[PDB]
Design a protein around this ligand. Structure first.
Ligand code: FES
Ligand SMILES: [K+]
Ligand SMILES: [K+]
Ligand SMILES: [Mg+2]
Ligand SMILES: [Mg+2]
Ligand SMILES: [Mg+2]
Ligand SMILES: [Mg+2]
Ligand SMILES: [Mg+2]
Ligand SMILES: [Mg+2]
Ligand SMILES: [Mg+2]
Ligand SMILES: [Mg+2]
Ligand SMILES: [Mg+2]
Ligand SMILES: [Mg+2]
Ligand SMILES: [Mg+2]
Ligand SMILES: [Mg+2]
Ligand SMILES: [Mg+2]
Ligand SMILES: [Mg+2]
Ligand SMILES: [Mg+2]
Lengths: 74, 137, 128, 72, 118, 86, 48, 142, 23, 97
RNA sequence: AAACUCCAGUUGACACAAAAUAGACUACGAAAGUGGCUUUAACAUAUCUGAACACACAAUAGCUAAGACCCAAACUGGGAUUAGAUACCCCACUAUGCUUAGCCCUAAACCUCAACAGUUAAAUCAACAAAACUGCUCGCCAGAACACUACGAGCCACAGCUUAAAACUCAAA
């Protein structure tokens, strides 16, 4: 959260997308239900931090692989 | 001088006095606080008995003897007989963890005696006799 | 046993030990030491009487001699302490270990095996 | 690093300098680093003793105006 | 070996105390001991009352006798001290200066996991 | 029985405050373990029972000290939220 | 070195001849083994 | 670990016992198995802190002379108040003196408790009186 | 674990000891 | 190869291990002044190492020294000898009021 | 309630009993076990494995003989309790716990982890316990119950221990 604001601005400035908030269960693995059957998922997910706030791997790391999304991560 | 909770050691030269008497000369109130009774004996520094009182000698019987108010009454009775013999300041030596352990001391004070020290002499064997077996309750 | 006047194994080869005061000789003798010091003199006596190289402590010969001294010490201990089950075990285990050593010496070097038996007074016996 | 041995002795003998580290400046030099550089220069001049190479280094810095207060 | 005899003597006058020490050191010599030193620790009040030879004692003279003796002398000396009426309490210990203290690097920490496991 | 009297477990009373003197004595005997010792000695605790209780008390103290250390360590971040809104 | 050190000490050892002199020489003297430690590990010898 | 459980997945989470956290909490959320542990152990820490202040003369000369003994100390889960219990004395006259000094000391003690940065956020301490059956003495007064 | 196997052995040994006593 | 690469060696900044107040000192049963510093003034109870701060080795030497001194007639058992009450307090225990 | 009242309290004298604190330590020994002090003796093995039975040990309880006996205490007696109480609760006291010299040889004798050697990479792994395995060796096991039993044999054991089945019975255990 020290960098949430910085990262969200970088995404908007480059014309891309940021998700720095609480990651709800199934955003990627259940996207059609949450967004709609025609929702397009990301083609690349860039992690500037790979751990969540309890020092466990961000759920999107596992779920990105499930959806066959390549991940860049610091 | 600052207050010391450590008693004056006999043979050393202390400045503390109580009615012109040294710590070694103050009479002793022996309180035996048992689980079912409380016995109080006041003796002189030379081991001369001056007063004796217990909850049983004060008309308490059975479970009533093992109460704080019974011990407090026993202290008042011993204090009265001791005060008649010239006792004002006493050293308290209490052995046992019975209900009249603290209450017996209150009665001595209410009876007109001034407690200058408190000593615990509850018998603790250092290894001794095997106590009775535990109770199934 | 060696005489009490015997010097300790450590002080026997210091130069000038024969010219010191009698009091100093008593303080460096077996009389003023524990029994373990008397056993070191016995072990060295057997090593020089029996083994070819008295300084080889890792040979099968030296081990049998060292263990034989322990066995005799246990026997003397148990002569006075007949209900000591702990040392009765140490004695019997040591006798078994010596028999195992003697078996391996008899099989590898019979000439040395015979000198060990004569020197230590061991009558070898085959197991039942 | 080899110089770490010199740093351990300097901190033991003279303690941490009352001057404050400025870890933002990538070219900052502390009193210990200045000591280490002089100690290295004198070693390259052929001196090999350790106890002697350390006492001569302190004198050089004092001549240059550096404050070296021994801890004890 | 080297022993240390911690000797508490009945509080007496100087002449009787010297006779007791001489009588005690001679007992060591008769048993083969080589006496090294005799130290006076001073007369003091005992830490508690000691009953010895049908008498109660509250003060005593503390003495040390450093000596060498054969291992068999200790048992015989302990019996000798029990019969001397002027000795309140006498104990023979191995001299502390013979036992060499091993060096200590410091206090190594103990892992907590081992504590509960053990 | 053979020791000097009025030295062990003896507290002097100050300004006639006998209640505070008794509390000091009780605190002394409690810290030295005498009160718990006297209580455990009223009935014989069997050796298998004493070892079980001593083992339980030693493990509970370790767990309590270890849980206190964790809370002390993890309370440094109890300060106000620096990035509120993010 | 241990035999040399020991050979000098034996000169001061008590003997049957010098027993009386050493016994009296002890009653006049005092040996103190008491000393206290501080939180810094320093020995505090007694005030005598 | 021991029979005492320490498998919590969020073991690295920073424990935050403050009054603001209670308001920003899911209403559905219920206390977890090892969530009581931190509360049970934090309340014990408060008992330790208070007990030392009473017996050290530096904190207050009046407090030290009283020789107050704490019977019980249990914080609240709300994080709004703290419950501390001290044992009453026989003399009702003496009881008044202890309560009066403790009542005024508490305000300063709270600041003294803030000196311990680990427990800097200390809710106002409620020095309840118990262990002496204060009502029984109150009944005799009537 | 449960002690049901121990209890069966318990009863068998109790009854055996009692039988031996009677006879 | 490269001069600036790290080199293998022992930690030069390592600090010495901690030592107890009695590390390196002989503990004698006749030194009752020292032994008295590790017993309770009111009860004579030997303090645990969590109170004395001693290491396992010196906690044991002190305990054996106290027990020897007590039964040989040098040290009281049921209380600390009052002569030694004003010695340096090296134990982490607070008693009075 | 019974019980004691040659009782209780203080002080002193006082053991063939048991060993606060230390010990929040985790040591010693083959295990069993070992925690007051001192001294003496003393803790096998310069490959490893190797026995229900050989050899030597083995808590508690128990037996035989002679002693000690503070305290505890089966049994027993007494006092309550209860529908009953040959229990739990209270009191008294014995065998016994102790010493000596012999036996007896059993434990949930259990870290419920066989010894020795090696590994942390694979697949981490039924579950739980105590992370998962490899080499090597000895011992042991083959549905339940019958069965810590019967018979045989050995044994200082004689209401004992060790070794240890079968028939009938079931579809589970
Ligand atoms: S720390 Fe070295 S002996 Fe205690
Ligand atoms: K003991
Ligand atoms: K077990
Ligand atoms: Mg059956
Ligand atoms: Mg083998
Ligand atoms: Mg076998
Ligand atoms: Mg077989
Ligand atoms: Mg068997
Ligand atoms: Mg047996
Ligand atoms: Mg028996
Ligand atoms: Mg009885
Ligand atoms: Mg009997
Ligand atoms: Mg066992
Ligand atoms: Mg095996
Ligand atoms: Mg079957
Ligand atoms: Mg059986
Ligand atoms: Mg059978
Ligand atoms: Mg048969």
């Amino acid at each position: 959260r020290q960098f949430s604001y910085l990262i969200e601005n970088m995404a908007r400035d480059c014309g891309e997308y940021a998700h720095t908030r609480y990651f709800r269960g199934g955003m990627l693995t259940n996207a059609r239900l949450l967004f709609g059957p025609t929702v397009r998922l990301p083609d690349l997910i860039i992690f500037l931090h790979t751990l969540n706030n309890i020092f466990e791997p961000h759920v999107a790391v596992r779920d990105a692989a499930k959806m066959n999304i390549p991940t860049v991560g610091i | 001088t600052k207050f010391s909770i450590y008693p004056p050691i006999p043979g050393e030269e202390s400045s503390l006095r109580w009615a012109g008497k040294k710590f070694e000369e103050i009479p002793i109130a022996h309180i035996k606080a048992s689980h079912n009774n409380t016995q109080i004996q006041v003796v002189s520094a030379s081991n001369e008995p001056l007063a004796f009182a217990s909850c049983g000698t004060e008309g308490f019987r059975n479970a009533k003897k093992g109460t704080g108010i019974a011990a407090q009454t026993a202290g008042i009775a011993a204090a009265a007989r001791a005060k008649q013999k010239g006792v004002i300041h006493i050293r308290v030596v209490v052995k046992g963890l019975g209900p009249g352990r603290l209450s017996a001391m209150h009665g001595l004070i209410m009876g007109g005696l001034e407690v200058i020290s408190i000593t615990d002499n509850t018998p603790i064997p250092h290894x001794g006799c095997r106590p009775r077996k535990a109770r199934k309750l | 046993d060696p005489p009490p006047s015997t010097l300790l194994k450590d002080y026997q080869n210091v130069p000038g030990i024969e010219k010191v005061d009698d009091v100093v000789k008593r303080l460096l003798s077996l009389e003023m030491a524990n029994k373990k010091e008397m056993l070191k003199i016995k072990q060295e006596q057997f090593m020089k009487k029996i083994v070819a190289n008295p300084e080889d402590t890792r040979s099968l010969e030296a081990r049998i001699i060292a263990l034989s001294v322990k066995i005799r010490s246990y026997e003397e201990h148990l002569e006075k302490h007949r209900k000591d089950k702990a040392h009765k075990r140490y004695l019997l285990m040591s006798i078994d270990q010596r028999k195992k050593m003697l078996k391996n010496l008899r099989n590898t070097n019979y000439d040395v095996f015979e000198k060990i038996c004569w020197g230590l007074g061991i009558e070898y016996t085959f197991p039942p | 690093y080899h110089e770490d041995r010199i740093r351990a002795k300097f901190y033991s003998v003279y303690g941490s300098g009352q001057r404050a580290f400025d870890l933002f400046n990538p070219n900052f030099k502390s009193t210990c680093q200045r000591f280490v550089e002089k100690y290295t220069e004198l070693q390259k001049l052929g001196e090999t003793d350790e106890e002697k190479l350390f006492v001569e280094t302190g004198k050089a810095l004092l001549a240059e105006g550096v404050i070296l207060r021994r801890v004890g | 070996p080297r022993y240390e005899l911690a000797l508490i003597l009945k509080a007496m006058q100087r002449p009787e105390t010297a006779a007791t020490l001489k009588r005690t050191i001679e007992a060591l010599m008769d048993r083969g001991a080589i006496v090294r030193d005799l130290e006076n620790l001073g007369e003091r009040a005992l830490p508690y009352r000691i009953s010895a030879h049908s008498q109660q004692h509250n003060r005593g003279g503390y003495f040390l006798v450093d000596f060498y003796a054969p291992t068999a002398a200790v048992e015989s000396m302990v019996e000798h001290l029990s019969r001397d009426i002027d000795v309140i309490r006498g104990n023979i210990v191995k001299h502390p200066l013979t036992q060499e203290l091993k060096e200590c690097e410091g206090i190594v920490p103990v892992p907590l996991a081992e504590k509960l496991y053990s | 029985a053979k020791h000097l009297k009025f030295i062990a477990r003896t507290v002097m009373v100050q300004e006639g405050n006998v209640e505070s003197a008794y509390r000091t004595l009780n605190r002394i005997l409690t810290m030295d373990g005498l009160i718990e010792d006297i209580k455990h000695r009223r009935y014989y605790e069997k050796p298998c029972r004493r070892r079980q209780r001593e083992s339980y008390e030693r493990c509970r103290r370790i767990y309590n000290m270890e849980m206190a250390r964790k809370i002390n360590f993890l309370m440094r971040k109890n300060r106000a939220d620096p990035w509120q809104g993010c | 070195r241990e035999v040399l050190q020991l050979q000098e000490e034996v000169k001061n050892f008590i003997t049957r001849e010098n027993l009386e002199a050493r016994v009296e020489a002890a009653l006049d003297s005092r040996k103190n083994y008491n000393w206290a430690i501080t939180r810094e590990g320093l020995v505090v010898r007694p005030q005598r | 670990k021991v029979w005492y459980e320490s498998p919590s997945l969020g073991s690295h989470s920073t424990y935050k016992p403050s009054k603001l956290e209670f308001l920003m909490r899911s209403t559905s959320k219920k206390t977890r198995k090892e969530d009581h542990a931190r509360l049970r152990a934090l309340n014990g820490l408060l008992y330790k802190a208070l007990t030392d202040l009473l017996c050290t003369p530096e904190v207050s000369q009046e407090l030290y002379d009283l020789n107050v003994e704490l019977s019980k100390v249990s914080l609240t889960p709300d994080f709004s108040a703290c419950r501390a219990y001290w044992k009453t004395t026989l003399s009702a006259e003496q009881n008044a003196h202890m309560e009066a000094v403790l009542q005024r000391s508490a305000a300063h003690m709270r600041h003294l408790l803030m000196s311990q940065q680990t427990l800097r956020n200390v809710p106002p301490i409620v020095f309840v009186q118990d262990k002496g059956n204060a009502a029984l003495a109150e009944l005799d007064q009537l | 674990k449960n002690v049901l196997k121990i209890r069966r052995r318990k009863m068998n040994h109790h009854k055996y000891r009692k039988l031996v006593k009677k006879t | 190869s490269n001069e600036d690469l790290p080199i293998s060696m022992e930690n030069p900044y390592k600090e010495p291990l901690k030592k107890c107040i009695l590390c390196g000192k002989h503990v004698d049963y006749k030194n009752v002044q020292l032994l008295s510093q590790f017993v309770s003034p009111f009860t004579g109870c030997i303090y645990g190492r969590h109170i004395t701060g001693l290491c396992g080795k010196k906690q044991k030497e002190i305990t054996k020294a106290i027990k020897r001194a007590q039964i040989m007639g040098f040290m009281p058992v049921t209380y600390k000898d009052p002569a030694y009450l004003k010695d340096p307090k090296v134990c982490n225990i607070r008693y009075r009021e």
